[PDB]
A = this chain, B = another copy of it.
Amino acid sequence: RGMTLEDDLNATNEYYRERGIAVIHKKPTPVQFRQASTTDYNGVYRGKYIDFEAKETKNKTAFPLKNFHAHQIRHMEQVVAHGGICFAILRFSLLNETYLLDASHLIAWWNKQEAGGRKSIPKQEIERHGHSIPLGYQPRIDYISVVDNVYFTR
């Protein structure tokens, strides 16, 4: 059960809410299936606005940018400009490795792609600029532990 990144995040976000750690939800799918103009997850943690998109790939050496679209990137650009904590949770399924990558890096790669660059982010770039997320029983994907250390004054 619960194999996909989406399933793991559902279990994780429910845990964070029920245990009083953070209030983050996956936005309902736009019906009136239309394509969303924002990222799928957002909420509040320590008074700050948290916003992220989560994608996974079977690729073992690079993360395909086709997993994202222009509107999501534009939205992330706006969130960053307004002081929100924005990132992508990227999983390499076949390696059981999940990373948190700040939106600034995803935005840059998306733009480079648009400028004629490669259409996938090399995994080494994600390891370099991103943060490995601890996996466990509960929460399954402890991305808040990473958010704490990266975006707040410990």
Contacts and interface: CB of A to CB of B under 8 A. Distances in A.
Interface of A: 17, 20, 22-23, 25, 27-32, 34, 36-38, 42-51, 75, 78-79, 81-84
Nearest to A42: B42
Report how many copies the assembly holds. Answer: 2
A82 B27 contact: no
A37 B25 contact: yes
Given A23-B75, A25-B38, A48-B48, 4 more contacts: A23-B84, A27-B27, A29-B32, A44-B51
Kindly name the residue among A20, A30, A51, A84 whose own CB sees the greatest number of chain B CB atoms within 10 A. Answer: A84
A46 B78 contact: no
Nearest to A25: B38
A83 B46 CA distance: 6
A81 B31 CA distance: 31
Given A29-B32, A38-B25, A47 B84 contact: yes
